[PDB]
Structure formats: C-alpha cells, structure tokens
Ligand binder design. Sequence first.
Ligand SMILES: *[C@@H]1O[C@H](CO)[C@@H](O)[C@H](O)[C@H]1NC(C)=O
Ligand SMILES: *[C@@H]1O[C@H](CO)[C@@H](O)[C@H](O)[C@H]1NC(C)=O
Ligand SMILES: *[C@@H]1O[C@H](CO)[C@@H](O)[C@H](O)[C@H]1NC(C)=O
Ligand SMILES: *[C@@H]1O[C@H](CO)[C@@H](O)[C@H](O)[C@H]1NC(C)=O
Ligand SMILES: *[C@@H]1O[C@H](CO)[C@@H](O)[C@H](O)[C@H]1NC(C)=O
Ligand SMILES: *[C@@H]1O[C@H](CO)[C@@H](O)[C@H](O)[C@H]1NC(C)=O
Ligand SMILES: *[C@@H]1O[C@H](CO)[C@@H](O)[C@H](O)[C@H]1NC(C)=O
Ligand SMILES: *[C@@H]1O[C@H](CO)[C@@H](O)[C@H](O)[C@H]1NC(C)=O
Ligand SMILES: *[C@@H]1O[C@H](CO)[C@@H](O)[C@H](O)[C@H]1NC(C)=O
Ligand SMILES: *[C@@H]1O[C@H](CO)[C@@H](O)[C@H](O)[C@H]1NC(C)=O
Ligand SMILES: *[C@@H]1O[C@H](CO)[C@@H](O)[C@H](O)[C@H]1NC(C)=O
Ligand SMILES: *[C@@H]1O[C@H](CO)[C@@H](O)[C@H](O)[C@H]1NC(C)=O
Lengths: 317, 317, 317, 165, 165, 165
Amino acid sequence: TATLCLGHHAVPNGTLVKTITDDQIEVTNATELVQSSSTGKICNNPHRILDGIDCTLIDALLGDPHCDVFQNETWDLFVERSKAFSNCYPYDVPDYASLRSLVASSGTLEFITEGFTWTGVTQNGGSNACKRGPGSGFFSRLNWLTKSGSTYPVLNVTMPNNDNFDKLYIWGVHHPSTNQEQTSLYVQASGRVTVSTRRSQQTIIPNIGSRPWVRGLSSRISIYWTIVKPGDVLVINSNGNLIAPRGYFKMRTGKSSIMRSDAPIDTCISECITPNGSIPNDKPFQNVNKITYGACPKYVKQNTLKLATGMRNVPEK
Amino acid sequence: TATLCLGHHAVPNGTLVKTITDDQIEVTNATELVQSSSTGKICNNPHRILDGIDCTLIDALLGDPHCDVFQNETWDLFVERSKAFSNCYPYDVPDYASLRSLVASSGTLEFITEGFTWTGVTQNGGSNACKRGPGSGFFSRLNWLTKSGSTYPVLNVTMPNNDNFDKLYIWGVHHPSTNQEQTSLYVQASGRVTVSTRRSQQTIIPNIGSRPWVRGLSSRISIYWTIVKPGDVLVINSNGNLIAPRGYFKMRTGKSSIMRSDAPIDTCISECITPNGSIPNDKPFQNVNKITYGACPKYVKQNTLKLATGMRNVPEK
Amino acid sequence: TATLCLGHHAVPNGTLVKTITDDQIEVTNATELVQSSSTGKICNNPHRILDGIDCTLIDALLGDPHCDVFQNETWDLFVERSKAFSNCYPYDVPDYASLRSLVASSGTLEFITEGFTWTGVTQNGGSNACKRGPGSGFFSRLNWLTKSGSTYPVLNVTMPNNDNFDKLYIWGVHHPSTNQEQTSLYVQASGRVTVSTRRSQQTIIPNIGSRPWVRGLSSRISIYWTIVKPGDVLVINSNGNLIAPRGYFKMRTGKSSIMRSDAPIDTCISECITPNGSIPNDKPFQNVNKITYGACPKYVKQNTLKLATGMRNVPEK
Amino acid sequence: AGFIENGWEGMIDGWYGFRHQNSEGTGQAADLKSTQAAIDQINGKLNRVIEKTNEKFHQIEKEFSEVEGRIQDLEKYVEDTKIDLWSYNAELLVALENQHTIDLTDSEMNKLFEKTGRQLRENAEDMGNGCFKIYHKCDNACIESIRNGTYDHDVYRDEALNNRF
Amino acid sequence: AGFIENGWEGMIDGWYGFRHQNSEGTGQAADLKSTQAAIDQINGKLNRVIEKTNEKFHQIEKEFSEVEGRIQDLEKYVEDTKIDLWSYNAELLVALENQHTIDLTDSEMNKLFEKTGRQLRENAEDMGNGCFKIYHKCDNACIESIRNGTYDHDVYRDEALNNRF
Amino acid sequence: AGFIENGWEGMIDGWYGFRHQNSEGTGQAADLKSTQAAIDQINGKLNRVIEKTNEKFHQIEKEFSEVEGRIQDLEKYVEDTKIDLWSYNAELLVALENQHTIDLTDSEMNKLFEKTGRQLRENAEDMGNGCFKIYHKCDNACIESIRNGTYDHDVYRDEALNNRF
Ligand SMILES: *[C@@H]1O[C@H](CO)[C@@H](O)[C@H](O)[C@H]1NC(C)=O
Ligand SMILES: *[C@@H]1O[C@H](CO)[C@@H](O)[C@H](O)[C@H]1NC(C)=O
Ligand SMILES: *[C@@H]1O[C@H](CO)[C@@H](O)[C@H](O)[C@H]1NC(C)=O
Ligand SMILES: *[C@@H]1O[C@H](CO)[C@@H](O)[C@H](O)[C@H]1NC(C)=O
Ligand SMILES: *[C@@H]1O[C@H](CO)[C@@H](O)[C@H](O)[C@H]1NC(C)=O
Ligand SMILES: *[C@@H]1O[C@H](CO)[C@@H](O)[C@H](O)[C@H]1NC(C)=O
Ligand SMILES: *[C@@H]1O[C@H](CO)[C@@H](O)[C@H](O)[C@H]1NC(C)=O
Ligand SMILES: *[C@@H]1O[C@H](CO)[C@@H](O)[C@H](O)[C@H]1NC(C)=O
Ligand SMILES: *[C@@H]1O[C@H](CO)[C@@H](O)[C@H](O)[C@H]1NC(C)=O
Ligand SMILES: *[C@@H]1O[C@H](CO)[C@@H](O)[C@H](O)[C@H]1NC(C)=O
Ligand SMILES: *[C@@H]1O[C@H](CO)[C@@H](O)[C@H](O)[C@H]1NC(C)=O
Ligand SMILES: *[C@@H]1O[C@H](CO)[C@@H](O)[C@H](O)[C@H]1NC(C)=O
C-alpha cells in the first residue's frame, strides 16, 4: 500500500483578522485597508497647488498690498496658512464663508478692468492703514470714491453684460466712525448704496460709529458681491460711501477648491491631498482626515482594518 | 448494471452576473434591477398633475394676468416649464425658494378675500406693465394702495385669526425709481411697512432708485409673507409703499410638491414621476434622475445591475 | 450490530426569523433587537437633568421673574415642557433657534456682572408686564436704559476681554409703539444700536408701531447676541433704545444639550434619554423616537427584528 | 461531478433531474422537489425581502440655476452623500444576492446527489462524474423507485455486492 | 439525515449529540464540544462584532412647530435620509446574521456526522437517516469510545466486515 | 482532516498540495490548479469588486473656528452621519470579505480531497486525517498520475480490494 496526504501550507507567524463567525482568526497573510499616515507634505502634482503664503483667499481677491503676487492667479487647490494675516483698511464680509466658497470653486482671480465712469467724485482714495510702497494706498481691485470739491452727486452707472459668461463684481460700503467724517469725506448725512440687476437688488445703509481700533482705524468697510449673467445689466446707485468695483472677476466652473493647512509643498506626485499632507490612495479607507481633496480613500473612524489575503493559518505544532 | 446520472439544465446562451468571489459568472437567467429609461411623458394618474403652462408657481400665487386660470387650483404635483415667463409689474421675492416651497407643499391656491379696510388711501392702483384686458392692471391677489387727494395716513389694520387653520398672507413693498415718484404716489419722503403677529414682526424699508428696465419700468415690488395661526392676529402698519393683501391663502399639509420639467402630460397611469417623464416602479433602483416624486425606485449611479434568477450556466460543449 | 444516531435538540414551540434564502424559518431561540418601549420617565442619573418647569431656556437666560431659580444653573440636558410660558416684557429673538442651540450646548447660565458704566441715562427701568415682587420689573440680566432728565447722550462703552475664555453677551433693542413714546422715553426721533468687536459688527434700527397686545403691551424688545473672544473688545454705541447687557455668560464646550418632553423625572439610572422617557440601551436599535440623548440605540423604522440565537427548530411530529 | 462537467441543454421539464441508461435504453426526467425548492428561494429573494420601495413627496431642490454659496453647497453635499451610499448598497447587495443564488443552486444539486447516494447505499458507486454505477439490473420501474424515494436497497444487495466485489 | 427528519425534544444537556441502541438497551448523551462551538460563534455574533452603540449629545432639531422654508426642508431631508439608511442596514444585517446562524449550526451538525463516519471507517454504514449502522457488537463502553474520539476501528474490522459483506 | 489538524510549513511551491509515502520513500508537490483558483478569487476580491475610489473636489467646510448656530449644527450633523455610515460599511464589508476568504479557501481544500477520493474510488480509504490509504502498491509514477488526474482505478481494483477486504 501507500499513503497520499492532502493538505495546505502554513506559515511560522500569521496574522489575525475578524470574520462574521470569529472575532480573531489567524490567517497566512492579511493586508491593511486603512491609510493611517501622511508624508507631512503636500505634493505639487498632478493638481495645481497655490500656496497663499500670508494671504487668505479674500485678501487676494480684494487686493491687499501683500497679496499683489496673486493677481490673475489660478489654482486647483488654494492653500490657506495659519500665519496668514490682513494688513489693509479693516473690513468685514457679511456671509464671508459664501464668498470664500464662490471664489474657491471658480478657481481664478482673473480680473478685467471695466470703463466705469464716476463723475463729480474723487477717485482712488487710500489710507495709511493700507500702505502701498512708501505712501498710502488701498485694495487694488476697489475704488474708494469721495467728494469732489464741495459736492458728491448721486452716482448712477450702467454696465451691461454682452459677453458669454458670468461676471463677478466685488464692491463695498464704507462705515465712518463719526458724523464729522461722513460729511467731510462724502458730504452726506445719510448715505446709501444700491446695486442691482434685472433679477435682484441689494441696498446697504452705512452705520456710523466707533469700532475697536484696528491698524489705527476705528472705521470699517463691508464687502458685498453680485453676479451678472449674460444679457443682464449691472446698475450702481449711490449718494455716498461707495467702494466701487474697478471691473469684474471672470467666473468659471470646475474642480477647484480651498483647504487650510500648515503642511509644506514639495516636488512629488499624489492625487489625494489632506491638510496633514498628501496620502497614498491605494487603500479604500483612510483615517488621516475628514478634509480631503482629489482621488481620496473614504474617511473612517477605524485606525485599522485587516483583510485576509489567504487561508487560515494552522501551525504544525 | 445501470447508470443513473444526476444533473441540471443549461441554456444555449446565458447571461453574466457579478458575485463576491467572481467578477463575471454565466448564469441561466438574470434580471435587471436598474430602471434606465422613461416614457418621456408624465402620467396624469393616480396623482393630480397641474401643468403650469407659461406660469411659475409664484406668478400663479400673486395673480399675474396670464395665470388667472390657476385661481383656487389644487395639485399633488405642480409642474413648471422652461418656457414660463412673467408679464406683470417687475418684482422680487427675498428668499424666493422658501416661498416656492411653502406654497408647493401646501398644494393649493385657495384664496379667501377678507374685509380689510384701508382708509384715506386710493385702492386698486395698476400699471401698463401688467395689462389686464385692454387697460392697466395688477396682480389679482394684491392691492396697490396710493395717496388719496393730497394725503396718505398711517394705516393701522387688524385682522384676527378666529378660524381653526393657518392663514398665509402675501404682501409686498413698493420701491420707486425716484424721489419724485414716492412723493407723488404716496406723498411720503420715507415710507415703511410693518407687518406683525403676537410672536414675530417684519419691518421693511423701501429703497429708492433706478434698476435696469423691465417691461418699461425701472421700479420694483418686493414680496413678503407671514403666517397667522389660530388665536393669533395680523396687524399691518404703514405710512407708504404698501402692496396690501386682499385676503389669505388657506394652508394645508400633505403630499403635494413641485417639479421642473418640459415633458408632456398624458392619459396613462404611473405612481413615479421624474422630470424625464414617468417611469415604472417594478425595479428597486433607477438611474433616470435624482429628482423624483411618488412611489419611486432609489437613484443609483449604475446604469445596470444584474441579479441572477438561476444557476450557473455550464454548456454541454 | 448497534445503531448510533446523531442529531440535535428541538423545542416544543420555537420562533420565526428571516434569512436571505427564507422569509420565515423556525428556530429554537431568537432575540429582539429593537427597543420599542420606554419607562415613561426620565432618569436623573448618570446625566444631570435640569427640569425647566414653566421656563424655556431663553426665558431662563434672559431672567424672566418666574425663572429666577435657574440663575447660575448647569445641565447635561435641559428639559423644556409644553406648559412653559413667558411672563415678562414681550420679546422676540431673530434666529431664536441659534441662540437656543448656543446656550443649550454651552451647558451653563453662569453669569458674571461687569462694571459697565452708562452715563447720562437712567438705569434699571421696568414694566408692569414683568412684575417682580409686588411692583414693576424687568429681565434680571438686562438693563433698560432711558433718558435722564431731558437728555440721552450717545453711549460709547468699551469692555475688553482680558480673560482666557469666550464671553457671551446678550443685549437687545426696544421697539416703541409710537412716536409719542420714543421721544418721551429716550428723547430720540431715530434710535440705533451698534454692537461690535474687532472682527464683526451688528447695527440694529428700531421699528416704531403697534403690534398685537401681549400682557397689556403693544411694544416689543428684540434680543441679539455677540461673542467676544480673548484679546478682543466689546464696544457698544447707542443713541436710544438700548437694552444693555449687565455682564456676560461664560461659554463652555461639552456634552450638554436640550430636549422637549413632558415626561416626569425620577430616581433611576439610564444612559439613554428620549422625549418619551429613558430607555434601555442593551439592544442595537430602537423605534421609540428619533430624538435621543446619550448612549442610545440607533433609530429604525422597524418595530421588531428577530435575531436567531440558535438553530432551526424541527419538531419530532 | 457531471454537473460540474456540464449542464443539460436537453432538460426542459425542471432545473434539476435525472438521466439514465439501463437494459430498456435511455431516458430523462426532472426532479420536481429540488426544482421547486430552488425556485421558491429565488422568488423570495427577487422580492422585497430586505428592501422595499418608499414613497416620497416634497424634498429638497437638487438642481440649481444660480450660484448661492453655503446652503447650496450643503444641499449638494447631502444629495451626493445619499447617492454614494445607496449606490454602494446596490453593489454590495447585488453581489451578495448573486453569491447566495449560485451557492443555493449548487447546494440543491449536491443535496440531490447525496440523497440519491444514501438511497442506493452499497448497491452503487460514485463514478466521479455525477453518476452512480448501479451494480444490479435496474429497469425503468427501479429507476423511478429511486427517483421518487422508494428504492429498497435490501432487495438488491445480494446481487449488487457480487457485482461490486 | 435524521437531523433533517427531526430534532430531539428530549435532548436537554446540549445542542448536538448522540442517541443509541445496543444490546444493553438505549441511551442518549450530548456532545459538548460541538455544542460549545456553536454557542461561542453565536455569543460572539450577538455581541458588538460589526457594530456598537455610539454616544451622541447635541444634535439638530428633528421636530418643528412652524413652517420655515428651505432650512427646515433640508434638516428633515437629512434626518429622513439617515433613518432610511440605518433601517436598511438593520434589515440586511439581521437577515445576513440569521443566514449565517442557520448555516453554522447546520454545519456543526454535519461536521459531527462526518467526524463520526471516519472514526467508524468501514465498520459502519450510513443509513440515510442520520444514523450509522454499526456492524459489530458495540456495548456501552464502545459507544462512549466513539463519542469521546477513541474508537479503534482496527479491532472491529474482522467482525464488522463479515457482517457487512 | 489533516488539513484541520495542521497545515504544512514545509510547503512553499503552492497553497494546496499533496504529500506522500510509498516504497520509494516520501515526497511533496503543490497542486497548482487549486492554488491558482484560490488566488484568482482572492485577487479579484482585493480589487474594486463592490467599491471604488471616488474623486471629490469642492465640499462643505468640516472644521469651524467660531460658534454659529443652526447651519453649523447641520453641517456637523451631516458629516458625522456620513462618517458613521461609512465606518459601518467598512466593518461589515471587511468581516464579510474575510468570512468569504476563509470559506473559499477551506472549500478549495475540501474540493481537492473529494476530487482525489473519487479518482481512487474503491482502491483507497479515507483515514480521517486528510489522508488516503491506498491499498495497492503505488510508486512515484502512480502518485503523479493521481496528482495530474489520470489515475485509472480499473487497473488496481483486483489488488486493492484484496488488501482492503
Ligand atoms: C489679467 O487678465 C486681463 C485679461 O484681459 C488683462 O487685461 C490684465 O492686464 C491681466 N492682469 C494682470 C495682473 O496680469
Ligand atoms: C468711543 O470709544 C472708543 C474706544 O473703543 C474711543 O477710542 C473713541 O474715541 C470713543 N469715541 C467717542 C465718540 O467718544
Ligand atoms: C492631522 O491629523 C491629526 C490627528 O492625528 C488631527 O488632529 C489634525 O487636525 C489633522 N490635520 C489638520 C491640520 O487638520
Ligand atoms: C375660492 O374659494 C373661496 C372659498 O370661500 C370662494 O369664496 C372664492 O369665490 C373662490 N374663488 C374662485 C376664483 O373660484
Ligand atoms: C439711471 O440710469 C438708468 C440706466 O440704467 C437710466 O435709464 C435712468 O434714466 C438714470 N436715471 C437718472 C437718475 O439719471
Ligand atoms: C433626464 O436624463 C438626462 C440624462 O440622460 C439628464 O441630463 C436630464 O437632466 C434628465 N431630465 C431632467 C430635465 O432633469
Ligand atoms: C454666579 O457666579 C459668579 C461667579 O463670579 C458670582 O459672582 C455670582 O454672584 C453668581 N450668581 C448667583 C445667582 O449665584
Ligand atoms: C393700532 O391698532 C391697534 C389694534 O391692533 C390698536 O390697539 C391701536 O390703538 C391702534 N393704534 C393707533 C395708532 O391708532
Ligand atoms: C413617543 O412615541 C410616540 C409614538 O408612539 C410619538 O408619537 C411621540 O411623539 C413620542 N414622544 C415625543 C414627545 O416625541
Ligand atoms: C415510485 O415509482 C414506482 C414505479 O413506477 C411505483 O410503483 C411507486 O408506487 C412510486 N411511489 C411513489 C411514492 O410515488
Ligand atoms: C472514552 O470512553 C471509554 C469508555 O468509557 C474510556 O475507557 C476512555 O478512557 C475514554 N477516553 C477519553 C479520552 O475520555
Ligand atoms: C501524469 O503523470 C504520469 C506519470 O508521471 C505521466 O505518464 C502522464 O503522461 C501525466 N499526464 C498528464 C495529463 O500530465
């Protein structure tokens, strides 16, 4: 006679996995399905990464003197840093978060200057709170209009959209610290700014008073925006406190976004970006972050998941 | 001896399905779980479908002269068309989308006229921008109040809810194009409209100025609404620019909704409506649209899913 | 020879469960995975439960005379009752729901009085609509400022945050019923209240007019709030209608929340609270409610789910 | 097995069955009990066992004609999240259901085989091709007795064992 | 099998076991190793293997007393979406878990049967009713030897084969 | 089985295979068809069978530096809901996939065993330890014939049955 024995391989040291019927079963091999680490750096390929160094996207949009390098810049991902700071005339943006989202998803700061004509007013006013070069200045994409001589007319300007794309207009309203400023700056006891299209309008009333001092100023500027579609018309009506647009930003649709991260950017390639740096995307899940951009693994709570890649390991003994 | 062979059937041409262990396995039969097509038409049964032909729900609500056919109409589903247009005094609705949602879910335009008494004012003013018949007109559910003789009193009117249901009041505020209109129309340099209940109030200040011309007018009307519950009271206070309610809409709860679609409506029966037309609901999933109404299959990305309805197909060879 | 029979146990009366291949299969034993009932009572352990008896969280925050017992109180869960009512000067809170959420999640009404100095005005005004003791009164955490003698100066007060935590300030704006009240109360034809920080500002304009009568008053107070972070500064500017803060609420982060329930509270222990009372948390699912607090089972639609805890039951016959 | 080597394209009166060869020639018949059992399990599964159609009415807007900011971003996010999760459920469910259909139908075939093998006992051998070699003369009445569960192995052992050994 | 024909309502000392008849009369005993194995798999499954209770605190409002418009519509939508998905997970999970419980307990029964069959080797025949016919005298000590895994088939073949053939 | 008692730490040319002892001494060889079948099923499963990576771009904000009220509460709620559901899917999926891997690899081992048993027919006995006792002289050429599916049991029965009985 003869003996024919059937069997399978085993390994000296296997690994444990979980099944429906068993909490821990040893298997010959298992792989890891959760990516739990990053390189600590953001890769600059294949996506276009724009490091706002000390700028926020809104300061870059408005034209803060330290952000002059971002004029007409584009990105797939705009990266904000914790060290970013503003250094211009103090301002606020009602619904800041929406404007930040609109610009971030458009993906561009391409700006086209338009021939707005403002008559009977002094154009291009600035402040020592926004120095540009050795003297006073202002945001590069805004025009601070003030009285001319002894008057300030009601401004009524029309700017039609005869193009085949949407135009984004950024404008604002000045808020003087006192009654003695508003009548020396734009000779008006009660200003108003109205900006409208064929479908909607926004009217803003300025609010006089001292705020905490920021960069030497107790006054503020509020930022507002409007979108004009092809065939529509932009109309601006004001009797004081207008921080006029100088033109429009071209709007786009696409894959562009924004992230907050202090990670450095390097010469490597990775499709998945998290605020902790780029991660591999060769696993179905990750627990590095919830904030991701690009071709990323799904975020899960688990730090580890082991998937058997082989059979039960039963040692010889 | 004898031979007894056991086996199973096979078919000349089977179909492929996916399993956990196999990417493609041939089976005798398989069914399709994703509904990927529509008839291109909306069925008028069992649901009540209201085709707004050239009307939007809001124009039907306000009383645009082309929408006079929708007075006191009801629906389970209101259908808006891409060809719909407005043709009345130009207007805007702050938070348009919420009003559209409220009315759509109520499911009715039933309107009850109330005995509001407006004294010292001229009632029923109209415009050539909203012609009704051969002459001027206005929205049928609104009352444009203007000066009487040389004055305009402050209007203070009270309308209690002694009923057992909620009342929806639609009202608005006029926005003149100029200082020379507001003092000839309702003799007032600065108008205000305040509408309130025992729980909340809304005060609107009119904004003077020219907007782009729509149907010959540079002026606008803003639409606002309030809901008065049983036991509450409606109070209206104004010193100019009031587009008064003429009564209330009766509010209801239920299955009613709204959809945007250019699909035609026909004499067929289907429980599931999508903007591409009605679809069968005999499959668990569909990929026709994400916008659905009624007893619909779940929307999935997949264009196809095959479910084996039989065993593996192994041909004789 | 001999017979050796192999088999398994059976029970006289088994239970039915559902599987992938069978709609109903009898098994020896099965357990219930859906918790479908409550005790009808809320347990006061391990969580700290604060029964607002006739108070809402906002009345407790503002200082309604019936809620004086909740001063400096804390909770893990604040419980509102359907019988709760207000009994003070009539008020409204724009975005009521957000303020209710902020306070509920902070978990405390700890209040610190600050040395605000209001000069040229009369402090601590009250009303017969908010009686405290036998005479007139007001909300305990607010200061109603009115004219002094024949004047009312513009108030400009600064209160810096030099602490290491966020400060919540509650303040409001008075809305007189008439032009004959606003000039006798705070001698001003047009009041305004501006409250600001280094990052944002709020300016409120009062609205004159009669509202439905509540507790004998046709006038109203609107409630607003602001948060001042460490290093920031609170600035208040007003020329009339200011219901001043008396200090700040200390903000916290944590597990605190709010629930609406008419269930009584008792001396028992339970980690899961629903508005129908506490429930056991020894099952993975529940269908008692969707509103839960603490270590609760997941809410499902199903009233029952049976999980086999044993084998198929096949009776002897 | 013979049911691994192939199926029968010539079997149309059921899903599972028998084919035979004896002194009277050849023949075929479906087994209706295993055919119906496989069918009942499948018809159940193809029905609303773990899922059903839900009826929905008013819902959020899913398409937009304007750029709005935060609320619209959240509405889109919520809808995309819902779709990804239901698309996942559909893939997993179909693959699980198909895995179970293949396994239940292979099992019904193996059950019929074991059922037959124990009826035959020692009077037949498993040839490794889904067939049993019966070691005694077994005419058409005998084959039907095996097919309907009434074969008595005790009246054949004396012949069958002589032919096997 | 006999374990398909029925279970034993008279077996209370375990889940799986043996029943026998010999020259000393009849008897019964549970098999504790297969009983415990089935129990351990089940007790694991009934525990937090793929799910656990999460502790939640402040959340969105889920009930409303007023008609608000878009935000409320989105809040309701989000909650309904969550409920439909968890209700689905509960149906699929329970049906999968029950499918696995039935399959693991049927398998433990079949494992005991095969285990017994190979201990007996050629000294016994499978009668098709979950029973083995043992072809040699097998007294109560013999039956326990089979039950505890110590049966030596080599001391019985000479008798058992004479009785089988 | 012997494949339950243990695996072979000495088998490195495949996953499943044969080990033998005969008159020429001992030896070992992997079975490549069952090894590859188990591998193909696993490599498929480890790939995007029921799931794939989705590419996402602009999304909602998930972290906040300020206390906002209702919108922020809803955004957080939506994200937590998404995470709990995907975390659940990951637990269930991995446990199901691991359950299927163990079951398919145990089944491939049992298939090789049954495949061998029916090639041997009556010329061998199952010893209960994953081994077949072959009752005829079977040299290295014979063992390879069994291993590659060409063993002819009809040329050995006359010897094998004399040794078995
Ligand atoms: C931005 O692009 C426009 C395109 O017409 C061009 O006119 C303008 O000069 C560019 N500005 C900068 C800073 O490059
Ligand atoms: C108002 O208060 C600020 C401090 O925040 C102070 O700097 C400013 O001079 C004050 N202005 C008036 C009107 O007195
Ligand atoms: C990176 O991961 C850590 C957890 O280890 C987390 O605390 C941190 O917030 C993540 N990165 C950022 C900047 O979001
Ligand atoms: C609408 O219904 C009300 C119910 O009282 C009725 O008075 C009114 O005349 C109806 N209007 C139309 C257009 O039918
Ligand atoms: C304001 O501009 C518009 C063009 O949009 C024009 O039609 C209107 O007459 C102008 N009005 C004034 C106040 O000059
Ligand atoms: C109908 O389906 C198509 C995809 O083929 C889609 O583009 C379209 O938007 C759907 N219908 C509507 C009007 O939503
Ligand atoms: C609330 O706590 C503060 C802490 O400084 C204390 O000054 C104040 O008196 C306390 N108030 C009450 C009602 O206990
Ligand atoms: C305004 O109407 C109310 C009723 O809501 C009444 O009590 C009040 O006296 C009226 N006031 C005026 C200004 O006549
Ligand atoms: C308690 O459960 C019932 C359903 O039986 C439900 O109607 C009720 O709303 C729940 N409790 C509360 C107060 O939410
Ligand atoms: C089985 O078939 C045989 C031969 O045709 C017949 O005599 C017997 O009665 C049948 N038994 C049953 C239960 O149908
Ligand atoms: C098995 O049972 C027999 C008879 O009772 C006994 O002699 C033997 O020692 C037992 N063996 C074990 C391992 O329990
Ligand atoms: C199987 O092995 C034998 C012995 O080595 C050899 O003669 C035969 O040709 C092989 N057959 C196949 C199909 O490889």
